[PDB]
Design a protein around this ligand. Structure first.
Ligand SMILES: Nc1ncnc2c1ncn2[C@@H]1O[C@H](COP(=O)(O)O)[C@@H](O)[C@H]1O
Ligand SMILES: Nc1ncnc2c1ncn2[C@@H]1O[C@H](COP(=O)(O)O)[C@@H](O)[C@H]1O
Ligand SMILES: Nc1ncnc2c1ncn2[C@@H]1O[C@H](COP(=O)(O)O)[C@@H](O)[C@H]1O
Ligand SMILES: Nc1ncnc2c1ncn2[C@@H]1O[C@H](COP(=O)(O)O)[C@@H](O)[C@H]1O
Ligand SMILES: O=P(O)(O)OC[C@H]1O[C@H](O)[C@H](O)[C@@H](O)[C@@H]1O
Ligand SMILES: O=P(O)(O)OC[C@H]1O[C@H](O)[C@H](O)[C@@H](O)[C@@H]1O
Ligand SMILES: [Cl-]
Ligand SMILES: [Mg+2]
Lengths: 417, 423, 423, 422
């Protein structure tokens, strides 16, 4: 019987097990033998067939019959990447041929897919067919607008539930939480959590007009919302910040971010965006009775058990991968568009400028973004022109209306309105 | 004086009602509108007594609605009272709305609620009152573009999956079969959604039966074949999800057997009382006679009212916020007698008459599309005897032996089921 | 070779079984023991065929059990197969245990499972095998010191509260009364726990009835009084929780009315089949006849099997870890024919004789203590007519008016209920 | 009718609303008037009765009938503390008499109870009765042993569920998470979450023998656990750290903790331990020492998301009984008492019985590291015990995993048996 091998690459997302079971269960009904490589390409890169065998397992019906309820991945994952070296690529080719892998399914991000195509192109098309399923919790695949990637629904819903507790806590014991939503790629995850939870403010890189963000502008955007809420008798709230703000900041802004120190280098992971904003905002607003606390919402989302939408989603993706193999497809991506799972050749999705799959960002011109902005607390262009409103907000900050306009009014040219 | 927006809910609750109320109210308050809410739908507006209506209306303020987007249910309650049947009731609703000076009237409910809103509007001047309705259903049976859900459906399906997950673990830990009955007779979207997500071994919905009337025996035998095939693979346990809508597709003879070889119950006006039917219990009793000797135990379980007021999941929280905003946008843009729906990621008003089915006069009902790729994929992961499975004699021998019957006896009893349901 | 520890589960699952299996297995593996698990309790050990047993036993390794403490159910399954009835079966179990060289034998189950283990142990030499059983019950009906829970109860009560919370929101959103039936006939701990936690308006458990046999009419009237009092305060909705144990206290006459004025269903041996009873449904049908004219609708809801394999809450995860450790400690200290229980914060073995009730030959059943302060506190927050309430003429007038009857009729019908249930 | 005034103090815990609803509903059945002070003692300390009146609300049936489902507190809370000044204490007394509060219920932890008594001793017990309910997710009130404070079960259960997700993620994508469990008073919460979730290590201040912890010892306790797992083929795990380790650290340890800088301080000269990042600092050090071995280490805080979770059934029943017991203590003439539950009975316990004689403040209940429960929890942790350090084969295996000689490993790590109880 033909052999199907499955591996995972990248960081986990809810529903990985859904894809593994959807592909494996269907393939077993076709009589295929299914194996799974542990930790992605990590051991295939060695080329030692004894080492690979010690870290491959037989994906049987009993193993995969009930993993669709479970977060994470039963065959683990790694970022091991054979595309960098031709020797590593040939080590992967050597082990796959030894195991007679006829069909090769990789579940991972663009890096995982790129490794799969690199191994396949140097291989004969008759012996092995390679398909990859694109995975990302950031919802940044170029699907038709409003169509989500698998894992995104689970991450956003658990994120909403965490922020709900912080909304109740900020009101019960007045304070502001600056929630930092992990992920520097796009603003989908931060905006989704914020809109669902009714957070009072959300800042994503996509809403900044200029190409580089300044640290001062971020502080003042949060500061204006805090003062406006304070002008309405509320000294508390929650503000959600996409970590992607950091990767759009200028060199000078990063210098201030790291404590007016030189930024570390080989390193945006060491940045503490929410904490730095908390310290500065306490200097400016602590005298008003405002306390500010940072909180990151990251790794606890990646292996949450999938919500029903992702369980259905990944089952259909697993079926679609096996279907593509049966129809002779190779070097393709299993994606779902308009309710249909279809193979899509890798380059058809690539951005020529990047060499990687195109990144779908938040469309800040869409009606959905404007609707989300409507329910946020913020100072618009019209608000700065409202003399009564500006007087109350400035008074809340214990400064003159002229001083408030002088400091904050320019922000209407910093972010889309 | 500021314009008055009045809000009411009709029908059975679905998760996210408060989200629509909070979206419409918060935006309206930013526009300076005064917002009021009618308790229990059309119940008191139908009386025509303005004192009774005022005793059951409340002021929807910022403080009230600021955090109800987290909460299931509806803070202004709901009712199925329907003024559309009588012109006296319709004029009573108009009399009370004019008394309260309602400029904008938003109803959140099913088709009966939307129709009542439109009937009240036709007798009213378009300048004095504008009427918008937001379509709500956990059954997902609105005619939106295919694969796009109605609000509350995602919450109901996700909680349904979690309950069935416990029953899946319990069925395997202590071998048994659960017949889960998914509440809702309109369509099979909810039953199939829960079953596919939870990996249930079988799902039966009215949409997959080719004939116009289902027979009670055919339902029993479809489950029986699934139980036996699982038993042929060493598994004497499972979970089967049944859309309650099977009952409403059943023939007269089938309903007689369903109610215990009794005369089906009827209401005072002659409508058969299908709420008193217990599909999962009746099928379990029949299957226990046939399969108990094999070591099979079967238990019914209903998944109903615990879904309706579950707190909305993030998808519905965003959905109902966008719908509430869209209701206010439609009022500002002069629309009336329209339904706020979301299509391809855009919330827009759609005129009520544009959504009617001309043959019926009512809003068209979207059922499960059993020819779609989604339904075929769901069917693949179910345990069942396909057309090809009945022709595989090695398989038929193993299943027949599991049921303690001859291969010829098995073919005679069950093979006709391939003409009962689409394959 | 290393000592062999064999583990099986019997009876119905409870949350935390896997915690006990992992607690015993992890500690034993650190001691160098070999650990095996029998699938489906005594089911295959009863055959006596050692090849059949080996095909349904698995090696409990570190990798198998390292993370099952998060998971409900039991990875080695369970059954109610019971070898105590026959020594032909008991000796079949003895034959397989000796073949597998089981030095230590741990069973997690009810009284049948514990008794089967000791019966098999009595025929074996004390040097070759030591037998320990961990008592399991989600009903909280073990004779622990009062207010101390059995493992699995905290999880079941908490999930039950969450279900009733959705029904409390739904009953208020769309006015109705839910009659929630908490499955389990041994005691009222589970029904009373869910009701108190969720703030349900009424709870009825068999333990609060003074007489030895309950009448169907009295149960109907106790609910009826609560509905009327709530109706007298403007609330035409609520939730009432009923322990299924009420059925097992009902008189012969009461059971006749319960089953539709029919002869109660019976098994082949002539014993009544109370599982076929539908307590919540029958009470709902009767209460609708009496109260439908008042605008009351009533719906039943069962809370049963979805509790048994829910993932354990933190209290049960810690509990079952300590029980698993205590079983291995008991083996190390030479105990046998003992029950591993936790009392006053200490896991200890307790000899079977200390817990058996001589009148029954089964472990003593701890029921709700209706004289305790905890029960009185729970009753305070219920809606109900007390002795003092019936003597309040102003209150009786309002409740009777809510029921559309004279105060004399109300007192004549309902006042006797103060002698039916403890006050 | 008599007036019952209710306030919440301290950080929120799940079930505050349960106490408010239990006390308010029963008091309303007795015909009492119930009011609630917003934000604890914050406004009562001003002495301005006009301001206090603007921040009190009438606790009615409709307000409280269904808040037993809800986390947080509808009357908010604060750490405002009249205990510090006699000037403030008289301000609270002045406002309470002005509002004619006969019964005064405070819902909070040890600091809140102590503040209530300071107000109580200068007031007549007949004129005003002051009762407090035990609130803390830190479980550090001096209740009868094995009896939890309310909110602890909810916090521990949500903590278990969060750590479960981190457990699946650490195994799926091998890494170590250093979870920092908020709370410096005691180790009940950190140890509870770790035990329920099967975390590989838990460090609480209670298990350190010496009075002052050294930063190097904390780093090495985690390092030994990581290396031992590495010796068994596991390069991933979860370690739970009580934030209270920070408050036991010596002056030198705090200097290293804040980046080899002088610790930040408030205007009075006390160290600002809130600015410390225990898990982050340990992660940086351990990545330097172990990154080459294939170890990735990430810090993670489990704090504020626990405090206002909706209560679990145990806390719902608990706080319902506590609110009832508070009203019962009022009816029976008790004052200056704490409502506690022991053997299924809610009873008042006079405040003085709970004071620590050396301190004058409410005694703080810590983890009893000699108890059987702690020993059982420790057995399921990954760690090097005294007997493990004396096992020559084990030491060779772990040392090889850490790429060091057995002699080097013994020199560095064996002294830890005198650092922490065994
Ligand atoms: N930026 C904002 N976002 C959301 N709501 C707001 C904002 N500013 C004001 N509101 C609310 O919208 C309404 C505006 O009314 P007013 O400020 O009284 O003209 C009030 O209910 C405010 O609390
Ligand atoms: N109707 C079905 N649905 C899902 N899986 C099945 C079904 N029938 C058989 N299987 C599984 O598919 C695989 C192929 O079975 P076989 O017919 O033995 O080749 C085995 O793992 C079976 O348990
Ligand atoms: N049986 C009951 N259980 C709980 N609360 C009640 C009950 N009866 C009345 N109440 C409430 O107790 C308060 C005082 O009642 P009353 O003495 O009638 O004014 C009101 O909030 C009533 O709604
Ligand atoms: N410190 C520890 N805590 C918990 N389990 C352990 C520890 N050390 C080893 N184990 C496990 O306990 C068993 C004892 O292994 P050994 O004593 O080396 O044969 C193996 O399953 C190990 O994985
Ligand atoms: O009940 P088990 O044999 O463990 O398997 C349960 C199976 O149920 C369904 O019918 C699906 O085909 C599978 O996705 C699932 O694995
Ligand atoms: O991380 P794994 O090796 O899969 O196992 C995780 C282990 O962690 C803890 O430290 C306990 O010793 C075990 O109860 C648990 O199984
Ligand atoms: Cl200073
Ligand atoms: Mg404290």
């Amino acid at each position: 019987a033909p052999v199907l091998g499955i591996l995972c690459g990248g960081g986990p997302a809810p529903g990985l097990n859904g894809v593994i079971a959807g592909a494996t269960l269907y393939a077993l009904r076709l009589g295929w033998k299914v194996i799974g490589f542990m930790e992605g390409f990590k051991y295939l890169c060695t080329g030692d067939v004894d080492v690979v065998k010690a870290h491959t397992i037989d994906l049987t019906y009993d193993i995969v019959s009930r993993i669709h309820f479970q977060g994470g991945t039963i065959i683990q994952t790694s970022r091991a990447n054979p595309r960098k070296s031709p020797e590593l690529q040939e080590n992967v080719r050597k082990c796959l041929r030894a195991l007679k892998v006829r069909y090769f399914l990789t579940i991972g991000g663009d890096d995982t897919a790129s490794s799969a195509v690199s191994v396949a192109s140097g291989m004969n098309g008759n012996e092995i067919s390679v398909i990859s399923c694109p995975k990302t919790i950031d919802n940044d695949l170029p699907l038709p607008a409003d169509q989500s990637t698998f894992g995104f629904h689970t991450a956003r819903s658990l994120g909403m539930e965490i922020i709900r507790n912080l909304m109740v806590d900020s009101k019960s014991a007045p304070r502001w939480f600056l929630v930092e939503a992990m992920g520097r790629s796009a603003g989908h995850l931060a905006l989704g959590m914020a809109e669902a939870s009714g957070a009072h403010l959300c800042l994503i890189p996509e809403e900044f007009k200029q190409d580089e963000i300044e640290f001062e502008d971020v502080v003042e955007l949060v500061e204006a919302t805090i003062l406006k809420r304070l002008a309405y008798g509320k000294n508390y709230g929650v503000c959600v910040l996409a970590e992607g703000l950091v990767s759009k900041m200028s060199k000078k802004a990063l210098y201030k971010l790291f404590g007016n120190r030189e930024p570390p280098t080989d390193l945006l992971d060491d940045a503490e965006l929410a904490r730095s904003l908390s310290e500065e905002l306490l200097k400016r607003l602590g005298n008003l009775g405002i306390r500010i606390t940072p909180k990151k919402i990251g790794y606890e989302l990646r292996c949450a058990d999938p919500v029903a939408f992702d369980a259905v989603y990944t089952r259909e993706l697993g079926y679609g991968a096996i279907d593509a193999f049966l129809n002779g497809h190779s070097a393709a991506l299993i994606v779902r568009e308009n309710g249909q799972v279809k193979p899509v050749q890798f380059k058809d999705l690539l951005d020529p400028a990047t060499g990687r799959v195109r990144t779908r960002l938040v469309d800040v011109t869409s009606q959905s973004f404007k609707v989300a902005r409507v329910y946020m607390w913020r100072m618009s262009k019209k608000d700065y022109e409202n003399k009564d409103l500006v007087a109350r907000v400035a008074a809340a900050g214990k400064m003159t209306p002229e001083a408030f306009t002088e400091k904050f009014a320019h922000l209407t040219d910093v972010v889309v309105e």
